[PDB]
Design a protein around this nucleic acid. Structure first.
Lengths: 40, 656, 225, 115, 60
RNA sequence: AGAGGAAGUAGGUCUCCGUAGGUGAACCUGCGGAG
RNA sequence: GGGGCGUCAGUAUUCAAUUGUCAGAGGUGAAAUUCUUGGAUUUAUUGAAGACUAACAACUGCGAAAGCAUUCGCCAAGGAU
């Protein structure tokens, strides 16, 4: 809620941008968010 | 879409004032007060004022003060600061006082910059210092409405006032005694004085001046009297024998020898003393725009001023000419697609066809059409081929240049031709659109209906109907059904123009979109209250929007330019992202860190910083291990320092 | 803020107060003050000179500002104007009207009003109608609540009312008739002469209407002013 | 003090602030109630009457009469014989912005027998 | 748009006055309910008199 | 224009004085000066 | 303020005309239909038509009943004393 527009923040509290993030890490972050959504 | 440029009101209703520097000019629009240079025409400044309409303003011969008084009883003085460049000025307030119990209607400022006199509606008339708020002496008290004043000296100063009845009274400021002259029958409009001749001229509404048709402004130069009244003509008279040699106001510069005419068409005419240029004050309510020439340098606008004005688009404010053939109100307007023929429909029952001669000052109305008994509402054009005229009544007509029919029940609205001239459709208030054969008297069919009442049709070089509800439809020739329907407006639409589509509203917004998609592309929000008509540049995509408000806004397309900018931006982005990956792979941590701070994405910047603080072979004097990274951290800019700090708090959160 | 109109209806606005001039109004003879106001009329030229409109108009003005006495806050008079001078507007009597506030302020319950109308002609051949109203007097030292006159008594009162107003308005000219209308001599004499039939609380003349004036004579019309 | 006669037609649907000379013939300046309010619901409102009275008093003080005799009326034939809110609010705003008031009278058309 | 403000603060040249007439059975009740009426009309600034002899209420 | 197939991306106070006007002795406002 | 016939008025409404108009007016809880720069609604003055007789007007009057309220004239009739 207090991050920048282009960037995301991880669970570690570190800003990483969606542009510099690769395709494999994008897929893995989508899978982890979908795993949390399935848990809830 | 960006605003290419606007044309704006300069004058509406109130009093105009000229400084002895004939560059600057202060005029009124509504409640506001706007001052502009005359020669370059750009907007110097605009003071807002209070909510009530402004009554009277003046500027001193030295353009140092601007004194405004509204219809609410108030008076504000503004000091002005002019640079060597006359392009822009800043007005700042000095004094706000309430002069009398009634709002003042007349003001007069002396040739020197030290006294201004003001005259009210009850008759209480006073004199004030301009540099500081005084009443240096009150002169009459409230008797009858003061309609004129004049400051003069005899070669200490004296001031003359002319009342609402014919009473001219002169007093010395030092003697402080008023003496009338004989007194006069009706409303004296203005008083002027010649110091070369020791002579007072009084011009009045009973068509007389004392040492016609009407009188509004008289004055000297110079030995040549002048007069302006309801006749519309300025007349020049000799001083010594009475043989010679509407208008709301006229002032006398003559050291610069220009006389300004404030015509009650709300126009400003510059006359030379032995039509230099004219500037239209307000295009009051614009009924139709049509963008005319072969090269399209000169748009013809049409409004309530009982005539048409041709003003240039390629100084940008100068009107080339004025063309008057109609009698009542010019209502609609249409040009041939092959150049030189413009045609005008009117509240007068006559319609007409004018030539446009571009490389001359010649403009003629040489084709006229009697037609039917009601107002010719709209004109359409396929020497031109012929003319199709519509009507306030149901009588639609078609006539050739060197036939009638019944179409609808109510007043019809708009008319448009195809570029090949085989089809023709008409639109009206009884929710029908009618296409018919244009050569014979035959009918090709009928559009089924647009819910309330259809306002504008358009042909695609596919027919477009804009209606009285908040919808707009696209119909065909083949089935006579709507192909497309669109919503999204908040009032009437009143004009649909083809691109190279766009639609104005009556909800002051003009919006563009495309037909095969069918969803809204962009919306445009410049204007004041209303919007009426749209013209288009025929070569490129430039939209000219005008309405009941007097401003006309010119928009140009920028989509190709911003697409080229986004394309080259993505080119530069992929190039510098690859050189960042190259510097990371090569181990050039310095230029890698510079390029990462430029590319603003930090997940790689953190890895570069962990590497440079653990390089395993650090320089002993260096702060972060590398002298080059020390150099860039020393030579960082302010925005890069602040963005680095905004990343440093996020890296400082993590204990790793 | 947003307009509402149809296509091409707002004409260019012209100033209507260039063509207007003021004209002071003088009242006729029997009123106390003469300057009563000022009228904004159109500017004279060919094709309807403004003196025709000034001959046409009438004014309605109260009697308090005429007599300078606020006893007559009611009884609004009407002034025709038939003559014009230089910056001047000479007037004549046309009618005399109450205010409807006093017409409500006079009617009470349990008492009778008697109304009477006459069409009388003065010696200057002006026909005019006089409408008189007369409310019944509640006698002091009485106990009964209703002061009702009988119907035959009302008819006798109305007969004496029309006899008085005819006999005391047929003999004088219009200027003497207005000079008798101003301090209400007629209502006083009706009150004095009807009290042998049934006493009347207040007799007023509520309307005077001038129907026809067959003469335009500047001699008598200026002998007024 | 030049007395102009202000006809205030206060109905329930719209209020008419109208200013004439002493004759009744020559209209000086009128501002209706609905031309100052965007809503036909709130066309007859004290705010509408206040705006209309302020505009009328501003125009008549630009002309310099500064004194009015006020005649208030309503729909009186088969109507209500009572003025709406426009009368009270227009007279309040009219004398609150200058305008020494002279004589007030409520001249409603009262039928002797209508239907 | 509909709310009306109380008047915060000589607006009369001719001293206006109105009258109405009442009968006797109302004269009793008006005579012993009048001080409330003239109290509130004095708070509004208008003098209110009652006349039991003629039977007339006047405001001025 | 078409159902499918396969794929990718997501800043002048106070006081005084001289003025000019206001409703006048005084007093108020505005200005120009001195403490 | 019982009935018939005539007559006299009074406003108000509608319609029309003459001016001043100059943007809405009208309805509604909101709206809409409608009338609206050839000028609606409004302001003033006249003219015509049809209707009805405010306030007075009631723990009343008259008529057998329904009913009957502008003034004046005529015509018979009726009640009580």
């Amino acid at each position: 809620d207090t991050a920048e527009k282009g960037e995301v923040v991880t669970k570690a509290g570190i800003p990483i941008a969606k542009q510099e993030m690769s395709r494999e890490e994008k897929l893995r972050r989508r899978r982890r968010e979908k795993e949390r959504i399935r848990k809830a | 879409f960006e605003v290419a440029n606007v044309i704006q009101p300069i004058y509406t209703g109130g009093s105009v004032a000229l400084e002895n520097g004939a560059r600057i000019l202060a005029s009124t629009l509504g409640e506001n007060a706007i001052l502009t240079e005359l020669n370059t025409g750009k907007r110097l400044a605009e003071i807002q004022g209070d909510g009530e309409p402004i009554s009277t303003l003046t500027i001193t011969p030295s353009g140092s003060h601007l004194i405004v008084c509204s219809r609410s009883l108030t008076m504000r003085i503004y000091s002005l600061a002019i640079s060597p460049d006359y392009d822009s000025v800043e007005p700042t307030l000095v004094r706000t006082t309430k002069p009398h119990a009634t709002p003042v209607v007349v003001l007069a400022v002396d040739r020197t910059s030290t006294l201004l006199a003001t005259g009210a509606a009850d008759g209480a008339i006073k004199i004030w210092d301009i540099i500081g708020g005084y009443v240096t002496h009150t002169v009459s008290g409230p008797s009858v409405l003061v309609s004129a004043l004049h400051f003069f000296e005899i070669a200490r100063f004296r001031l003359a006032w002319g009342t609402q009845d014919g009473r001219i009274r002169i007093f010395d400021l030092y003697k402080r005694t008023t003496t009338p002259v004989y007194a006069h029958e009706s409303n004296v409009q203005c008083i002027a004085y010649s110091p070369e001749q020791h002579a007072l001229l009084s011009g009045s509404r009973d068509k007389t001046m004392t040492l016609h048709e009407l009188l509004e402004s008289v004055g000297f130069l110079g030995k040549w009297m002048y007069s302006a009244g309801t006749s519309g003509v300025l007349r020049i008279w000799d001083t010594t024998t009475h043989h010679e040699i509407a208008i709301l106001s006229a002032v006398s510069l003559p050291e610069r020898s220009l006389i300004l005419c404030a015509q009650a068409d709300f126009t400003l005419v510059l006359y030379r003393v032995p039509p230099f240029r004219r500037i239209s004050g307000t295009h009051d309510e614009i009924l139709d725009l049509t963008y005319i020439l072969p090269d399209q340098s000169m748009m013809a606008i049409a409004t309530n001023s009982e005539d048409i004005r041709i003003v240039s688009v390629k100084y940008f404010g100068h009107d080339v000419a004025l063309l008057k053939g109609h009698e009542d109100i010019v209502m609609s307007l249409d040009v041939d697609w092959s150049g030189h023929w413009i045609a005008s429909g009117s509240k007068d029952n006559t319609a007409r066809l004018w030539r446009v001669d571009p490389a001359n000052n010649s403009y003629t109305c040489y084709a006229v059409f009697t037609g039917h008994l009601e107002s010719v509402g709209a004109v359409a054009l396929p020497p031109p081929a012929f003319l199709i005229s519509g009507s306030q009544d149901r009588f639609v007509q078609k006539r050739d240049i060197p036939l009638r029919r019944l179409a609808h029940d109510k007043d019809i609205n708009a008319l448009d031709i195809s570029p090949n001239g085989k089809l023709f459709a008409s639109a009206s208030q009884d929710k029908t659109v009618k296409i018919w054969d244009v050569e014979k008297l035959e009918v090709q069919g009928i559009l089924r209906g647009h819910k309330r009442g259809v306002w504008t049709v358009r042909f695609a070089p596919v027919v477009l109907t804009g209606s009285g509800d908040k919808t707009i439809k696209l119909w065909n020739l083949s089935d006579y059904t709507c192909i497309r329907t669109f919503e999204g407006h908040s009032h009437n639409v009143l004009k649909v123009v083809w691109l190279h589509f766009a639609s104005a509203g009556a909800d002051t917004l003009v919006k563009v979109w495309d037909a095969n998609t069918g969803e809204t592309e962009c919306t445009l929000d410049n204007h004041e209250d209303r919007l009426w008509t749209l013209a288009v540049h025929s070569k490129t995509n430039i939209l000219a929007s005008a309405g009941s408000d007097s401003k006309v806004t010119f928009w140009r397309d920028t989509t190709a330019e911003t697409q080229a900018a986004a394309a080259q931006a993505a080119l530069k982005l992929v190039e510098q992202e690859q050189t960042l990956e190259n510097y990371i792979h090569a181990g050039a941590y310095r230029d890698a860190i510079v390029l990462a701070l430029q590319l603003n994405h930090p997940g790689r910047l953190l890895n570069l910083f962990t590497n440079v603080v653990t390089t395993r072979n650090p320089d002993p004097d260096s702060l972060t291990g590398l002298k080059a990274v020390d150099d860039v951290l020393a030579k960082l800019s302010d925005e890069q320092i602040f963005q680095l700090l905004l990343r440093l708090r996020d890296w400082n959160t993590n204990a790793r | 803020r947003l307009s509402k109109g149809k296509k091409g209806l707002k004409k260019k606005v012209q100033d209507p107060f260039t063509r207007k001039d003021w004209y002071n109004i003088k009242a006729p003879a029997p009123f106390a003050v003469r300057d009563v106001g000022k009228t904004l009329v159109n500017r004279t030229t060919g094709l309807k000179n403004a003196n025709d409109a000034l001959k046409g108009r009438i004014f309605e003005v109260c009697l308090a500002d005429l007599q300078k006495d606020e006893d007559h806050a009611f009884r609004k008079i009407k002034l025709r104007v038939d003559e014009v001078q230089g910056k001047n507007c000479l007037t004549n009597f046309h009618g005399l009207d109450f205010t409807t506030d006093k017409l409500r302020s006079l009617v009470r319950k349990w008492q009778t009003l008697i109304e009477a109308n006459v069409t009388v002609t003065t010696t200057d051949h002006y026909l005019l109608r006089l409408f008189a109203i007369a409310f019944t007097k509640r006698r002091p030292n009485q106990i009964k609540k209703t002061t009702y006159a009988q119907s035959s008594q009302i008819r006798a009162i109305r007969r004496k009312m029309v006899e008085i107003i005819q006999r005391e308005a047929a003999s004088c000219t219009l200027h003497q008739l207005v000079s008798k209308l101003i301090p209400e001599v007629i209502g006083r004499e009706i009150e004095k002469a009807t009290q042998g039939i049934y006493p009347l609380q207040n007799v007023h003349i509520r309307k005077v209407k001038l129907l026809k004036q067959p003469k335009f004579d500047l001699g008598a019309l200026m002998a007024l002013h | 003090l030049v007395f102009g006669v202000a006809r205030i037609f206060a109905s329930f649907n719209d209020t008419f602030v109208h200013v004439t000379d002493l004759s009744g013939r020559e209209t000086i300046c009128r501002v209706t109630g609905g031309m100052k309010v965007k809503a036909d619901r709130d066309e007859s409102s004290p705010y509408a009457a206040m705006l209309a009275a302020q505009d009328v008093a501003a125009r008549c003080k630009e002309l310099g009469i500064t004194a009015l005799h006020i005649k208030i009326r309503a729909t009186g034939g088969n109507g209500t014989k009572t003025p709406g809110p426009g009368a009270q609010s227009a007279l309040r705003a009219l004398a609150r912005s200058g305008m020494k008031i002279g004589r007030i009278e409520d001249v409603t058309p009262t039928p002797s027998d209508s239907t | 748009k509909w709310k009306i403000e109380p008047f915060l603060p000589g607006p009369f040249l001719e001293e206006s006055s109105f009258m109405t007439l009442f009968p006797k059975y109302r004269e009793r009740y008006l005579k012993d309910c009048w001080p409330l009426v003239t109290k509130a009309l004095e708070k509004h600034g208008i003098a209110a008199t009652l006349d039991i002899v003629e039977g007339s209420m006047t405001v001025k």
